[PDB]
mmCIF file of C-alpha atoms in Angstrom:
data_model
loop_
_atom_site.group_PDB
_atom_site.id
_atom_site.type_symbol
_atom_site.label_atom_id
_atom_site.label_comp_id
_atom_site.label_asym_id
_atom_site.label_seq_id
_atom_site.Cartn_x
_atom_site.Cartn_y
_atom_site.Cartn_z
ATOM 1 C CA UNK B 1 -6.276 21.222 -10.946
ATOM 2 C CA UNK B 2 -7.208 19.263 -7.833
ATOM 3 C CA UNK B 3 -5.047 18.581 -4.788
ATOM 4 C CA UNK B 4 -3.480 15.249 -3.895
ATOM 5 C CA UNK B 5 -1.729 14.249 -0.687
ATOM 6 C CA UNK B 6 1.206 11.838 -0.908
ATOM 7 C CA UNK B 7 3.066 10.361 2.043
ATOM 8 C CA UNK B 8 6.162 8.208 1.582
ATOM 9 C CA UNK B 9 7.123 6.021 4.533
ATOM 10 C CA UNK B 10 10.211 3.990 5.340
ATOM 11 C CA UNK B 11 9.564 0.629 3.713
ATOM 12 C CA UNK B 12 11.255 -1.342 0.935
ATOM 13 C CA UNK B 13 9.743 -0.124 -2.308
ATOM 14 C CA UNK B 14 10.010 3.618 -1.792
ATOM 15 C CA UNK B 15 10.482 3.657 -5.569
ATOM 16 C CA UNK B 16 6.734 3.096 -6.048
ATOM 17 C CA UNK B 17 6.120 6.382 -4.252
ATOM 18 C CA UNK B 18 8.666 8.225 -6.375
ATOM 19 C CA UNK B 19 7.115 6.974 -9.615
ATOM 20 C CA UNK B 20 3.618 7.816 -8.390
ATOM 21 C CA UNK B 21 4.813 11.312 -7.504
ATOM 22 C CA UNK B 22 6.290 11.889 -10.940
ATOM 23 C CA UNK B 23 3.121 10.732 -12.663
ATOM 24 C CA UNK B 24 0.849 12.951 -10.556
ATOM 25 C CA UNK B 25 2.946 15.994 -11.493
ATOM 26 C CA UNK B 26 2.901 15.023 -15.153
ATOM 27 C CA UNK B 27 -0.876 14.732 -14.983
ATOM 28 C CA UNK B 28 -0.970 18.246 -13.504
ATOM 29 C CA UNK B 29 -1.898 17.651 -9.861
ATOM 30 C CA UNK B 30 -0.903 19.981 -7.014
ATOM 31 C CA UNK B 31 0.951 17.562 -4.780
ATOM 32 C CA UNK B 32 1.441 17.984 -1.054
ATOM 33 C CA UNK B 33 4.290 15.662 -0.132
ATOM 34 C CA UNK B 34 5.337 14.199 3.195
ATOM 35 C CA UNK B 35 8.578 12.223 3.336
ATOM 36 C CA UNK B 36 9.605 10.264 6.421
ATOM 37 C CA UNK B 37 13.266 10.166 7.496
ATOM 38 C CA UNK B 38 12.999 6.396 7.262
ATOM 39 C CA UNK B 39 12.055 6.862 3.608
ATOM 40 C CA UNK B 40 15.027 9.098 2.834
ATOM 41 C CA UNK B 41 17.588 6.465 3.838
ATOM 42 C CA UNK B 42 15.735 3.657 2.045
ATOM 43 C CA UNK B 43 15.737 5.297 -1.391
ATOM 44 C CA UNK B 44 19.499 5.634 -0.990
ATOM 45 C CA UNK B 45 20.297 2.158 0.313
ATOM 46 C CA UNK B 46 17.985 0.904 -2.448
ATOM 47 C CA UNK B 47 16.087 15.370 -3.578
ATOM 48 C CA UNK B 48 17.128 17.662 -6.427
ATOM 49 C CA UNK B 49 13.953 17.631 -8.480
ATOM 50 C CA UNK B 50 12.744 19.501 -11.526
ATOM 51 C CA UNK B 51 9.158 18.753 -10.556
ATOM 52 C CA UNK B 52 6.447 21.412 -10.543
ATOM 53 C CA UNK B 53 3.773 22.407 -8.019
ATOM 54 C CA UNK B 54 4.960 20.220 -5.158
ATOM 55 C CA UNK B 55 4.638 21.544 -1.603
ATOM 56 C CA UNK B 56 6.679 19.611 0.935
ATOM 57 C CA UNK B 57 5.661 19.216 4.571
ATOM 58 C CA UNK B 58 7.912 18.174 7.458
ATOM 59 C CA UNK B 59 7.080 14.712 8.784
ATOM 60 C CA UNK B 60 6.995 16.298 12.229
ATOM 61 C CA UNK B 61 5.099 19.481 11.375
ATOM 62 C CA UNK B 62 1.608 19.173 12.839
ATOM 63 C CA UNK B 63 0.773 22.768 11.878
ATOM 64 C CA UNK B 64 0.715 21.548 8.286
ATOM 65 C CA UNK B 65 -2.538 22.280 6.429
ATOM 66 C CA UNK B 66 -2.844 18.546 5.798
ATOM 67 C CA UNK B 67 -3.417 18.033 9.518
ATOM 68 C CA UNK B 68 -6.645 20.023 9.332
ATOM 69 C CA UNK B 69 -9.886 18.362 8.285
ATOM 70 C CA UNK B 70 -11.196 21.721 7.119
ATOM 71 C CA UNK B 71 -8.316 21.688 4.626
ATOM 72 C CA UNK B 72 -8.136 17.975 3.814
ATOM 73 C CA UNK B 73 -11.777 17.647 2.744
ATOM 74 C CA UNK B 74 -10.885 19.474 -0.480
ATOM 75 C CA UNK B 75 -8.357 16.878 -1.664
ATOM 76 C CA UNK B 76 -9.154 14.166 -4.190
ATOM 77 C CA UNK B 77 -7.387 11.607 -2.023
ATOM 78 C CA UNK B 78 -4.482 10.639 0.190
ATOM 79 C CA UNK B 79 -1.747 8.213 -0.816
ATOM 80 C CA UNK B 80 0.632 6.509 1.602
ATOM 81 C CA UNK B 81 3.029 4.899 -0.861
ATOM 82 C CA UNK B 82 4.730 2.904 0.304
ATOM 83 C CA UNK B 83 3.020 2.339 3.652
ATOM 84 C CA UNK B 84 5.272 0.550 6.163
ATOM 85 C CA UNK B 85 3.721 -2.033 8.483
ATOM 86 C CA UNK B 86 4.334 0.412 11.317
ATOM 87 C CA UNK B 87 2.432 3.243 9.618
ATOM 88 C CA UNK B 88 -0.318 0.797 8.683
ATOM 89 C CA UNK B 89 -0.658 -0.105 12.351
ATOM 90 C CA UNK B 90 -0.481 3.469 13.607
ATOM 91 C CA UNK B 91 -3.280 4.574 11.267
ATOM 92 C CA UNK B 92 -5.418 1.473 11.918
ATOM 93 C CA UNK B 93 -5.112 2.099 15.665
ATOM 94 C CA UNK B 94 -5.257 5.880 15.552
ATOM 95 C CA UNK B 95 -1.835 6.253 17.133
ATOM 96 C CA UNK B 96 -0.095 9.319 15.703
ATOM 97 C CA UNK B 97 3.692 9.481 15.937
ATOM 98 C CA UNK B 98 4.135 11.768 12.919
ATOM 99 C CA UNK B 99 2.234 14.002 10.504
ATOM 100 C CA UNK B 100 1.652 11.065 8.155
ATOM 101 C CA UNK B 101 -0.290 9.189 10.821
ATOM 102 C CA UNK B 102 -2.293 12.335 11.526
ATOM 103 C CA UNK B 103 -3.171 12.747 7.844
ATOM 104 C CA UNK B 104 -4.449 9.185 7.787
ATOM 105 C CA UNK B 105 -6.614 9.866 10.829
ATOM 106 C CA UNK B 106 -7.935 13.075 9.244
ATOM 107 C CA UNK B 107 -8.700 11.354 5.941
ATOM 108 C CA UNK B 108 -10.602 8.645 7.828
ATOM 109 C CA UNK B 109 -12.676 11.011 9.984
ATOM 110 C CA UNK B 110 -13.332 13.379 7.065
ATOM 111 C CA UNK B 111 -13.983 10.440 4.736
ATOM 112 C CA UNK B 112 -11.280 11.594 2.325
ATOM 113 C CA UNK B 113 -10.137 8.724 0.074
ATOM 114 C CA UNK B 114 -7.166 6.972 1.704
ATOM 115 C CA UNK B 115 -4.971 4.610 -0.326
ATOM 116 C CA UNK B 116 -2.154 2.463 1.098
ATOM 117 C CA UNK B 117 0.452 0.397 -0.749
ATOM 118 C CA UNK B 118 1.599 -2.403 1.532
ATOM 119 C CA UNK B 119 4.781 -4.343 0.869
ATOM 120 C CA UNK B 120 5.438 -7.147 3.353
ATOM 121 C CA UNK B 121 5.890 -10.934 3.313
ATOM 122 C CA UNK B 122 4.764 -13.172 4.818
ATOM 123 C CA UNK B 123 1.738 -11.585 6.491
ATOM 124 C CA UNK B 124 1.084 -12.274 10.166
ATOM 125 C CA UNK B 125 -2.380 -11.910 11.732
ATOM 126 C CA UNK B 126 -1.707 -8.319 12.797
ATOM 127 C CA UNK B 127 -0.886 -7.256 9.235
ATOM 128 C CA UNK B 128 -4.128 -8.839 8.020
ATOM 129 C CA UNK B 129 -6.331 -7.335 10.689
ATOM 130 C CA UNK B 130 -4.866 -3.861 10.267
ATOM 131 C CA UNK B 131 -5.537 -3.995 6.542
ATOM 132 C CA UNK B 132 -9.042 -5.295 7.241
ATOM 133 C CA UNK B 133 -9.769 -2.449 9.628
ATOM 134 C CA UNK B 134 -8.514 0.129 7.098
ATOM 135 C CA UNK B 135 -10.650 -1.519 4.413
ATOM 136 C CA UNK B 136 -13.830 -1.696 6.492
ATOM 137 C CA UNK B 137 -13.311 1.964 7.355
ATOM 138 C CA UNK B 138 -13.494 2.858 3.670
ATOM 139 C CA UNK B 139 -9.771 2.944 3.015
ATOM 140 C CA UNK B 140 -8.227 1.004 0.148
ATOM 141 C CA UNK B 141 -5.321 -1.350 0.651
ATOM 142 C CA UNK B 142 -3.158 -2.132 -2.348
ATOM 143 C CA UNK B 143 -0.416 -4.732 -1.891
ATOM 144 C CA UNK B 144 2.719 -4.117 -3.938
ATOM 145 C CA UNK B 145 2.074 -7.298 -5.943
ATOM 146 C CA UNK B 146 2.721 -6.648 -9.638
ATOM 147 C CA UNK B 147 1.057 -8.994 -12.094
ATOM 148 C CA UNK B 148 2.251 -10.449 -15.399
ATOM 149 C CA UNK B 149 -0.887 -9.713 -17.436
ATOM 150 C CA UNK B 150 0.907 -7.196 -19.652
ATOM 151 C CA UNK B 151 3.962 -9.454 -20.028
ATOM 152 C CA UNK B 152 6.415 -7.108 -18.271
ATOM 153 C CA UNK B 153 10.064 -7.016 -19.375
ATOM 154 C CA UNK B 154 11.721 -4.756 -16.813
ATOM 155 C CA UNK B 155 11.361 -3.897 -13.149
ATOM 156 C CA UNK B 156 10.143 -0.597 -14.540
ATOM 157 C CA UNK B 157 7.201 -2.372 -16.164
ATOM 158 C CA UNK B 158 6.179 -3.791 -12.792
ATOM 159 C CA UNK B 159 6.521 -0.444 -11.014
ATOM 160 C CA UNK B 160 4.240 1.189 -13.585
ATOM 161 C CA UNK B 161 1.717 -1.617 -13.148
ATOM 162 C CA UNK B 162 1.443 -0.989 -9.416
ATOM 163 C CA UNK B 163 1.415 2.790 -9.945
ATOM 164 C CA UNK B 164 -1.378 2.360 -12.476
ATOM 165 C CA UNK B 165 -3.357 0.324 -9.961
ATOM 166 C CA UNK B 166 -2.962 3.100 -7.401
ATOM 167 C CA UNK B 167 -4.218 5.718 -9.829
ATOM 168 C CA UNK B 168 -7.179 3.550 -10.852
ATOM 169 C CA UNK B 169 -8.209 3.432 -7.199
ATOM 170 C CA UNK B 170 -8.990 7.143 -7.375
ATOM 171 C CA UNK B 171 -10.211 7.063 -10.988
ATOM 172 C CA UNK B 172 -7.345 9.225 -12.225
ATOM 173 C CA UNK B 173 -6.930 8.727 -15.987
ATOM 174 C CA UNK B 174 -3.446 7.647 -17.107
ATOM 175 C CA UNK B 175 -1.394 5.928 -19.856
ATOM 176 C CA UNK B 176 0.866 3.525 -17.953
ATOM 177 C CA UNK X 1 14.976 -36.961 0.429
ATOM 178 C CA UNK X 2 11.674 -35.676 1.784
ATOM 179 C CA UNK X 3 8.428 -35.166 -0.117
ATOM 180 C CA UNK X 4 6.950 -31.820 -1.103
ATOM 181 C CA UNK X 5 3.522 -31.086 -2.542
ATOM 182 C CA UNK X 6 3.191 -28.261 -5.069
ATOM 183 C CA UNK X 7 -0.061 -27.005 -6.551
ATOM 184 C CA UNK X 8 -0.128 -24.371 -9.287
ATOM 185 C CA UNK X 9 -3.427 -22.556 -9.770
ATOM 186 C CA UNK X 10 -4.725 -20.240 -12.465
ATOM 187 C CA UNK X 11 -3.577 -16.799 -11.367
ATOM 188 C CA UNK X 12 -1.239 -14.188 -12.841
ATOM 189 C CA UNK X 13 2.241 -15.093 -11.673
ATOM 190 C CA UNK X 14 2.270 -18.788 -12.503
ATOM 191 C CA UNK X 15 5.972 -18.164 -13.130
ATOM 192 C CA UNK X 16 6.605 -18.098 -9.364
ATOM 193 C CA UNK X 17 5.360 -21.679 -9.199
ATOM 194 C CA UNK X 18 7.565 -22.767 -12.089
ATOM 195 C CA UNK X 19 10.676 -21.268 -10.496
ATOM 196 C CA UNK X 20 9.820 -22.802 -7.127
ATOM 197 C CA UNK X 21 9.387 -26.176 -8.817
ATOM 198 C CA UNK X 22 12.768 -25.981 -10.507
ATOM 199 C CA UNK X 23 14.502 -25.053 -7.269
ATOM 200 C CA UNK X 24 12.900 -27.888 -5.289
ATOM 201 C CA UNK X 25 14.141 -30.399 -7.874
ATOM 202 C CA UNK X 26 17.611 -28.884 -7.828
ATOM 203 C CA UNK X 27 17.644 -29.188 -4.048
ATOM 204 C CA UNK X 28 16.714 -32.865 -4.446
ATOM 205 C CA UNK X 29 13.091 -32.993 -3.287
ATOM 206 C CA UNK X 30 10.564 -35.568 -4.517
ATOM 207 C CA UNK X 31 7.879 -33.280 -5.874
ATOM 208 C CA UNK X 32 4.234 -34.204 -6.270
ATOM 209 C CA UNK X 33 2.793 -31.658 -8.679
ATOM 210 C CA UNK X 34 -0.774 -30.596 -9.346
ATOM 211 C CA UNK X 35 -1.417 -28.207 -12.229
ATOM 212 C CA UNK X 36 -4.820 -26.625 -12.808
ATOM 213 C CA UNK X 37 -6.132 -26.154 -16.360
ATOM 214 C CA UNK X 38 -6.445 -22.476 -15.515
ATOM 215 C CA UNK X 39 -2.709 -22.499 -14.808
ATOM 216 C CA UNK X 40 -1.805 -24.118 -18.123
ATOM 217 C CA UNK X 41 -3.354 -21.324 -20.195
ATOM 218 C CA UNK X 42 -1.882 -18.577 -18.000
ATOM 219 C CA UNK X 43 1.753 -19.638 -18.401
ATOM 220 C CA UNK X 44 1.163 -19.472 -22.149
ATOM 221 C CA UNK X 45 -0.691 -16.163 -22.338
ATOM 222 C CA UNK X 46 1.997 -14.849 -19.974
ATOM 223 C CA UNK X 47 5.386 -29.078 -20.417
ATOM 224 C CA UNK X 48 8.470 -30.714 -21.921
ATOM 225 C CA UNK X 49 10.697 -30.834 -18.868
ATOM 226 C CA UNK X 50 14.059 -32.362 -18.094
ATOM 227 C CA UNK X 51 13.223 -32.317 -14.398
ATOM 228 C CA UNK X 52 13.782 -35.319 -12.139
ATOM 229 C CA UNK X 53 11.612 -37.083 -9.553
ATOM 230 C CA UNK X 54 8.388 -35.220 -10.263
ATOM 231 C CA UNK X 55 5.097 -37.119 -10.007
ATOM 232 C CA UNK X 56 2.173 -35.326 -11.613
ATOM 233 C CA UNK X 57 -1.408 -35.662 -10.397
ATOM 234 C CA UNK X 58 -4.557 -34.762 -12.335
ATOM 235 C CA UNK X 59 -6.326 -31.714 -10.916
ATOM 236 C CA UNK X 60 -9.485 -33.816 -10.939
ATOM 237 C CA UNK X 61 -8.045 -37.072 -9.603
ATOM 238 C CA UNK X 62 -9.309 -37.520 -6.049
ATOM 239 C CA UNK X 63 -7.772 -41.003 -5.830
ATOM 240 C CA UNK X 64 -4.406 -39.257 -5.729
ATOM 241 C CA UNK X 65 -2.253 -40.164 -2.710
ATOM 242 C CA UNK X 66 -2.167 -36.465 -1.848
ATOM 243 C CA UNK X 67 -5.876 -36.632 -1.050
ATOM 244 C CA UNK X 68 -5.188 -39.026 1.816
ATOM 245 C CA UNK X 69 -4.191 -37.723 5.232
ATOM 246 C CA UNK X 70 -2.456 -41.014 5.949
ATOM 247 C CA UNK X 71 -0.188 -40.163 3.009
ATOM 248 C CA UNK X 72 0.050 -36.383 3.381
ATOM 249 C CA UNK X 73 1.293 -36.436 6.981
ATOM 250 C CA UNK X 74 4.688 -37.581 5.682
ATOM 251 C CA UNK X 75 5.306 -34.485 3.545
ATOM 252 C CA UNK X 76 7.447 -31.559 4.653
ATOM 253 C CA UNK X 77 4.814 -29.138 3.401
ATOM 254 C CA UNK X 78 2.299 -28.109 0.777
ATOM 255 C CA UNK X 79 2.752 -25.176 -1.583
ATOM 256 C CA UNK X 80 -0.041 -23.537 -3.563
ATOM 257 C CA UNK X 81 1.994 -21.223 -5.777
ATOM 258 C CA UNK X 82 0.438 -19.204 -7.095
ATOM 259 C CA UNK X 83 -2.839 -19.433 -5.180
ATOM 260 C CA UNK X 84 -5.729 -17.745 -7.019
ATOM 261 C CA UNK X 85 -8.301 -15.817 -4.988
ATOM 262 C CA UNK X 86 -10.774 -18.559 -5.860
ATOM 263 C CA UNK X 87 -8.553 -21.338 -4.496
ATOM 264 C CA UNK X 88 -7.816 -19.212 -1.438
ATOM 265 C CA UNK X 89 -11.547 -18.958 -0.809
ATOM 266 C CA UNK X 90 -12.267 -22.618 -1.493
ATOM 267 C CA UNK X 91 -9.612 -23.746 0.999
ATOM 268 C CA UNK X 92 -10.577 -21.138 3.622
ATOM 269 C CA UNK X 93 -14.200 -22.292 3.377
ATOM 270 C CA UNK X 94 -13.518 -25.987 2.922
ATOM 271 C CA UNK X 95 -15.244 -26.090 -0.448
ATOM 272 C CA UNK X 96 -13.490 -28.601 -2.705
ATOM 273 C CA UNK X 97 -13.943 -28.233 -6.458
ATOM 274 C CA UNK X 98 -10.654 -29.927 -7.378
ATOM 275 C CA UNK X 99 -7.815 -32.012 -5.952
ATOM 276 C CA UNK X 100 -5.896 -28.862 -5.015
ATOM 277 C CA UNK X 101 -8.680 -27.737 -2.693
ATOM 278 C CA UNK X 102 -8.778 -31.218 -1.182
ATOM 279 C CA UNK X 103 -5.026 -31.173 -0.532
ATOM 280 C CA UNK X 104 -5.417 -27.875 1.286
ATOM 281 C CA UNK X 105 -8.177 -29.340 3.441
ATOM 282 C CA UNK X 106 -6.050 -32.420 4.175
ATOM 283 C CA UNK X 107 -2.997 -30.336 5.064
ATOM 284 C CA UNK X 108 -5.138 -28.269 7.444
ATOM 285 C CA UNK X 109 -6.780 -31.227 9.208
ATOM 286 C CA UNK X 110 -3.504 -33.178 9.363
ATOM 287 C CA UNK X 111 -1.601 -30.040 10.370
ATOM 288 C CA UNK X 112 0.775 -30.387 7.423
ATOM 289 C CA UNK X 113 2.494 -27.062 6.653
ATOM 290 C CA UNK X 114 0.432 -25.164 4.064
ATOM 291 C CA UNK X 115 1.942 -22.213 2.185
ATOM 292 C CA UNK X 116 0.035 -19.922 -0.199
ATOM 293 C CA UNK X 117 1.382 -17.228 -2.524
ATOM 294 C CA UNK X 118 -1.359 -14.681 -3.122
ATOM 295 C CA UNK X 119 -1.200 -12.210 -5.985
ATOM 296 C CA UNK X 120 -4.111 -9.764 -6.091
ATOM 297 C CA UNK X 121 -4.663 -5.994 -5.945
ATOM 298 C CA UNK X 122 -6.409 -4.212 -4.420
ATOM 299 C CA UNK X 123 -7.628 -6.474 -1.614
ATOM 300 C CA UNK X 124 -11.313 -6.474 -0.709
ATOM 301 C CA UNK X 125 -12.580 -7.591 2.716
ATOM 302 C CA UNK X 126 -13.140 -11.164 1.533
ATOM 303 C CA UNK X 127 -9.521 -11.521 0.409
ATOM 304 C CA UNK X 128 -8.347 -10.267 3.806
ATOM 305 C CA UNK X 129 -10.614 -12.482 5.855
ATOM 306 C CA UNK X 130 -9.776 -15.589 3.846
ATOM 307 C CA UNK X 131 -6.077 -14.974 4.376
ATOM 308 C CA UNK X 132 -6.732 -14.336 8.068
ATOM 309 C CA UNK X 133 -8.618 -17.597 8.436
ATOM 310 C CA UNK X 134 -5.819 -19.530 6.689
ATOM 311 C CA UNK X 135 -3.277 -17.818 8.945
ATOM 312 C CA UNK X 136 -5.149 -18.444 12.197
ATOM 313 C CA UNK X 137 -5.489 -22.075 11.146
ATOM 314 C CA UNK X 138 -1.708 -22.397 11.034
ATOM 315 C CA UNK X 139 -1.291 -21.825 7.320
ATOM 316 C CA UNK X 140 1.150 -19.252 5.982
ATOM 317 C CA UNK X 141 0.115 -16.600 3.505
ATOM 318 C CA UNK X 142 2.817 -15.044 1.369
ATOM 319 C CA UNK X 143 1.802 -12.170 -0.909
ATOM 320 C CA UNK X 144 3.711 -11.983 -4.183
ATOM 321 C CA UNK X 145 5.258 -8.658 -3.130
ATOM 322 C CA UNK X 146 8.958 -8.617 -4.024
ATOM 323 C CA UNK X 147 11.141 -6.189 -2.114
ATOM 324 C CA UNK X 148 14.109 -4.073 -3.200
ATOM 325 C CA UNK X 149 16.431 -4.938 -0.304
ATOM 326 C CA UNK X 150 18.876 -6.781 -2.561
ATOM 327 C CA UNK X 151 18.713 -4.063 -5.236
ATOM 328 C CA UNK X 152 17.170 -6.265 -7.952
ATOM 329 C CA UNK X 153 18.035 -5.639 -11.612
ATOM 330 C CA UNK X 154 15.736 -8.001 -13.497
ATOM 331 C CA UNK X 155 12.272 -9.468 -13.125
ATOM 332 C CA UNK X 156 14.214 -12.653 -12.498
ATOM 333 C CA UNK X 157 15.744 -11.103 -9.383
ATOM 334 C CA UNK X 158 12.271 -10.398 -8.014
ATOM 335 C CA UNK X 159 10.993 -13.894 -8.803
ATOM 336 C CA UNK X 160 13.920 -15.424 -6.915
ATOM 337 C CA UNK X 161 13.235 -13.128 -3.967
ATOM 338 C CA UNK X 162 9.664 -14.367 -3.641
ATOM 339 C CA UNK X 163 10.750 -17.978 -4.228
ATOM 340 C CA UNK X 164 13.364 -17.576 -1.509
ATOM 341 C CA UNK X 165 10.708 -16.278 0.866
ATOM 342 C CA UNK X 166 8.569 -19.331 0.147
ATOM 343 C CA UNK X 167 11.435 -21.693 0.876
ATOM 344 C CA UNK X 168 12.314 -19.856 4.095
ATOM 345 C CA UNK X 169 8.759 -20.467 5.281
ATOM 346 C CA UNK X 170 9.535 -24.178 5.462
ATOM 347 C CA UNK X 171 13.168 -23.715 6.531
ATOM 348 C CA UNK X 172 14.524 -25.206 3.313
ATOM 349 C CA UNK X 173 18.135 -24.068 2.826
ATOM 350 C CA UNK X 174 18.854 -22.320 -0.488
ATOM 351 C CA UNK X 175 21.178 -19.905 -2.357
ATOM 352 C CA UNK X 176 18.796 -17.521 -4.132
#
């Protein structure tokens, strides 16, 4: 089973990251998870898990294997779901305030697939240019914009849509 | 009561445009509506209205008052909800295949507020640059990315969120 890196930042829509995490486990992926403090509060205002093969890394722990290119090059990809506008900026500018930012920088320099789920509205020029820079650098930017193709009925149907889009980015087969 | 221009293009999420239309009427706005053929099919695969003060214009009718700057300068703003990637491109490049594109060009040259609701995923560089050009030109780009701040329960709660964001762009008071 391959390795996947998943970072969850403090932005509205932390649920997308939870759902993505659950699916990766179900599909038998060894997940290395990074959860920001900002993300912890959000999932509440918006822990005990029976999930398998998940290794958690402290958002402040730069000794983490994920912070080493030599280690990261063996992963199938890196997800930052959801990716706050702040994290988007930090990665686009190479400013590293936490492990998550570092992992983005490592993915970029090691050319490891990097996927971001942005959830903001409206967009200002900075948001657009940061996403453009990520994109031009090989990264993939996915806005949390569910569609109505499949005639969704619940919020759950829209979450799965976005999660399915994220998995398709890395060609991971699924049934959502 | 002021005038509002609303264009609905063929893109997944035509529902956002329907909801926005209903709210504008309820808030007592004289709405000039343009509906693409592409949009008609979509709302089905995804007419008889008891709505008041709505004047409909043919997507191909360039004689429409909306195609005249002298007329458009008196509107509070122009909505293109939802705005397909094609329409986004046409307006950003000044290519006019239909009335809707023309109205975007008129709004831009007459500096009439222009608001677009984009629904696409993932974004490629073209999508980003088109949105950036619209933005730099004074237009406002709103991605159809509902948030979970208000703890939504139904798809309806997410539609209202996005619709509320669109109204806030033009400072129109509402209770959604």
